[PDB]
Point group: C3
Chain length 225, copies 3
């Protein structure tokens, strides 16, 4: 079950990479070129993640607990680009963009520590820290990010409402999966945990990528001269 | 002794993070927002460092020598922000900012190698290299950085004199502690070495952070219309 | 044989660092200062690489195969600067610069995985992936990069022809050496592989550095008022 879902991730991320790469190659306009390029690299990074996992790499047995550490390495590179999708579309200011990238980096890094710690009490402390770094981004996203975006696109508040809702709901599922997997309560087996992360990853990367493109189209139409 | 000082670092860095974060949240002005945000992340990074150390992580016994490697990982992230404090305040040019960030990165990286090398003769070679990377920053700071800053703020040369004096004196103490600890002569025990680094870290992060804010206030007053 | 070539690299990279550093110190003009600074750090990074290797560091015996992993760590830092040499000189746009830096980062990262994988079939898969990341840069370099550069310097198309030819020919030799060494067919001994990488590194760093400076001189003369 685990193995098939890892190859599904390889396929899904590769297809995402191809179609965003084609879009980047054909883009009319530097802003479109940038947006396609961000999403291409999100999916290209993840294709490499899923290939490494599918080939059996990136995994260690830590004190008897099988632990996939490689996803934190690539997440640390792809999740800032997903943030960049948001801050590019919302024309976010530099301090708020940096704060979002910093808080997100903090989240992934402490999530990594929460995962690889042999002492699972210590790991669960870092999980809480990581959750508070995530909540920091939530605060930034629904306050400063949203207000700037709505100020920049007064006629497109719904566009950013949908971007934020999809981002927040989907990303909140990750710490839930983490608590369900062998990092926490071990309420689901490894094959189910792998399926969950794979579906989340494809949705949060390929799915959000296409939403960001659709969002861009609406923003440009709303701001046609 | 070591354990208490690690928790003192957690507390001190957390308090620094809180007060810089409050300042960032209330800031009047993008330049103030940026400066508070830089210092928030300096202290937030260090809070995580000190929590990891306080919980017993980030340490290895290398050929019988207890070695705290995690501080080099976080220093590599926080020390460039301390440089950014300086180059933001001094409106430093791009090549000099990059040179400062590069030389500082070189210093921390070779300091890491100087620390983890089992062969302590090799480690001491890297210590010398790291010292010369530090001296490179000294040269850049008291020459190009200072002249640009004084050119940008002709009425505030004292402000940059104090920033540089505090930076240079405090940062020079780090290679001294390193020579005193079990990385060099082992003239002080681990508990004293830990206290020294903790006091240095709190002063160079929380202390320098507040100095940078005071400096900003003086710079803006000197350049009030 | 291996040991002498590692020290030759230390010497050659150190000399490159010194002369680019002198050029940076004397530069007339921010653009010249930037270009000298990029090449200084390329060579300074590599000096540290070659010192670590010369001192016997950065090498592991992986399942019986001596494997120099440290070169991928420093290549990951120096090769983007060589790209920056190109994109600085060609005034490349942001999406194409990012795409070049991203594809190059992908190449080095999968090259690292191709090298350290104990399962050499898996390693050879990553070698192919890394080759396709390199071919991605080739496509970007001879298409978008070149057209932008020729548009920016219509009277200096030969300058970018020489830059690209030297970059492409020299960098293509690296995957050939990799196939010849114990990472692939093991057709040359370690001492010869080390000599090959050392000569390639000195040429692609010190040599390309001086070519980039000569290129800059021609570009500025062609665009003298
Ligand atoms: C800020 C938000 C923190 C999130 C949720 C609190 C509960 C989750 C944190 C604690 C997890 C505990 C856990 O995983 O317990 C394992 C279980 O006891 C099997 O051995
Ligand atoms: C450029 C500046 C270099 C700094 C100082 C020179 C002296 C410090 C470098 C040498 C350190 C030697 C050391 O730590 O010696 C350990 C001692 O012998 C116990 O075993
Ligand atoms: C895209 C470009 C791929 C490049 C070349 C194809 C051939 C190289 C890839 C396969 C290498 C095989 C190899 O190294 O074989 C070891 C040999 O069998 C001793 O044990
Ligand atoms: C791989 C992605 C890593 C993301 C790291 C994010 C770091 C966040 C830290 C923010 C502090 C800096 C805030 C902005 C500084 C601007 C500097 C300047 O204007 O001179
Ligand atoms: C985590 C912090 C890491 C800091 C790394 C610093 C790297 C220093 C290297 C400098 C070389 C580049 C100099 C400026 C390049 C400008 C490029 C351009 O203008 O196109
Ligand atoms: C150490 C060097 C590492 C190089 C990493 C290169 C990353 C390449 C990824 C590209 C995606 C981003 C494309 C440009 C984003 C611009 C963002 C913006 O304008 O807000
Ligand atoms: C087998 C598993 C396949 C999973 C596929 C899921 C997502 C990735 C594919 C997305 C393709 C989008 C194409 C859009 C288009 O061009 O119309
Ligand atoms: C993963 C790799 C992606 C490669 C994408 C190549 C895009 C080619 C576009 C061709 C065209 O539409 O003319
Ligand atoms: C611990 C750190 C994680 C939370 C980071 C918070 C980022 C936003 C703070 C700010 O406004 O500067
Ligand atoms: C429960 C779910 C509610 C929280 C997730 C949706 C947030 C929407 C944010 C917004 O509309 O800007
Ligand atoms: C609202 C959604 C809440 C999701 C909560 C996840 C909790 C995960 C652990 C479930 C508790 C039982 C575990 C067990 O005993 O096997
Ligand atoms: C127990 C050890 C505590 C160490 C505290 C040292 C430094 C961090 C606290 C700094 C607080 C500054 C508050 C400034 C203010 O708001 O007036
Ligand atoms: C470490 C965490 C820091 C969080 C800082 C939160 C700042 C809230 C400011 C509230 C206010 O002053 O209105
Ligand atoms: C060895 C390297 C450490 C020293 C780095 C020197 C940086 C400044 C050089 C310059 O002016 O370009
Ligand atoms: C002994 C200490 C003297 C060196 C440290 C102080 C340097 C001050 C630099 C400056 O005033 O710009
Ligand atoms: C001026 C300040 C100089 C600081 C020098 C630090 C030297 C550290 C080592 C002290 C020498 C004796 C060590 C020993 O034999 O225990
Ligand atoms: C012993 C091996 C030495 C290898 C030397 C090769 C390359 C690095 C030296 C390059 C010096 C360039 C000087 C240019 C000049 O200033 O005229
Ligand atoms: C490696 C180190 C390089 C240091 C370069 C120092 C350059 C000094 C220039 C002196 C001058 O020409 O006046
Ligand atoms: C797999 C990834 C390596 C290839 C990266 C291709 C970069 C250029 C794609 C683009 O035009 O956005
Ligand atoms: C065989 C070698 C030919 C390919 C290498 C040279 C490419 C030149 C590119 C160019 O002229 O822009
Ligand atoms: C055109 C240049 C082609 C370079 C090709 C390199 C192949 C490397 C391996 C050589 C094949 C024989 C290996 C062996 O059996 O020892
Ligand atoms: C745009 C920046 C791209 C950076 C490179 C990302 C490539 C990731 C490829 C997967 C890495 C897997 C590592 C597995 C290590 C196994 C060790 C044994
Ligand atoms: C970006 C880095 C943030 C800190 C992460 C530290 C991880 C250390 C892992 C050590 C593994 C042995
Ligand atoms: C466009 C596609 C977005 C993702 C949809 C969900 C994919 C799940 C794969 C199992
Ligand atoms: C703004 C960028 C922030 C990057 C993340 C910094 C978070 C650092 C937290 C401490 C890391 C400690 C690592 C301990 C590893 C133990 C392994 C066993
Ligand atoms: C930024 C990186 C600079 C070079 C540092 C290399 C460290 C390698 C550590 C290996 C540990 C086994
Ligand atoms: C503002 C406070 C700056 C730091 C003062 C020194 C803290 C030492 C803690 C033991
Ligand atoms: C401009 C950015 C510079 C970053 C630092 C580069 C310094 C590289 C020095 C060589 C590193 C060698 C690491 C050897 C590790 C051995 C572990 C045992
Ligand atoms: C930049 C990083 C790109 C991915 C590289 C993953 C390397 C993992 C190495 C693990 C060694 C045990
Ligand atoms: C100086 C002229 C160029 C030197 C090239 C060195 C090549 C090293 C061996 C490569 C074999 C594929
Ligand atoms: C200027 C020098 C460029 C490099 C020439 C080739 C060096 C080979 C060293 C063995
Ligand atoms: Cl990923
Ligand atoms: Cl730190
Ligand atoms: Cl290198």
């Amino acid at each position: 079950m685990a193995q098939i879902w890892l190859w599904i991730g390889v396929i899904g991320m590769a297809l995402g990479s191809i179609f965003f790469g084609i879009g980047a190659h054909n883009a009319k306009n530097e802003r479109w070129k940038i947006l396609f390029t961000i999403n291409f690299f999100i999916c290209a990074i993840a294709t490499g993640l899923y290939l490494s996992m599918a080939l059996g790499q990136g995994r260690s047995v830590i004190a008897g607990r099988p632990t996939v550490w490689v996803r934190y390495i690539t997440w640390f590179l792809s999740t800032p680009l997903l943030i960049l999708d948001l801050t590019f579309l919302g024309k976010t200011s530099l301090p708020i963009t940096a704060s979002l990238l910093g808080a997100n980096a903090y989240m992934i890094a402490t999530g990594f520590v929460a995962t690889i710690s042999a002492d699972r009490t210590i790991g669960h402390i870092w999980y809480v820290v990581s959750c508070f770094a995530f909540l920091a981004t939530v605060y930034l996203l629904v306050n400063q990010y949203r207000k700037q975006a709505e100020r920049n696109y007064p006629q497109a508040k719904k566009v950013f409402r949908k971007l934020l809702s999809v981002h927040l709901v989907l990303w909140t599922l990750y710490p839930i999966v983490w608590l369900l997997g062998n990092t926490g309560f071990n309420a689901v087996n490894q094959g189910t945990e792998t399926m969950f992360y794979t579906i989340l990853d494809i949705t949060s990367k390929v799915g959000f990528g296409f939403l960001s493109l659709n969002s861009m189209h609406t923003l440009e139409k709303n701001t046609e001269s």
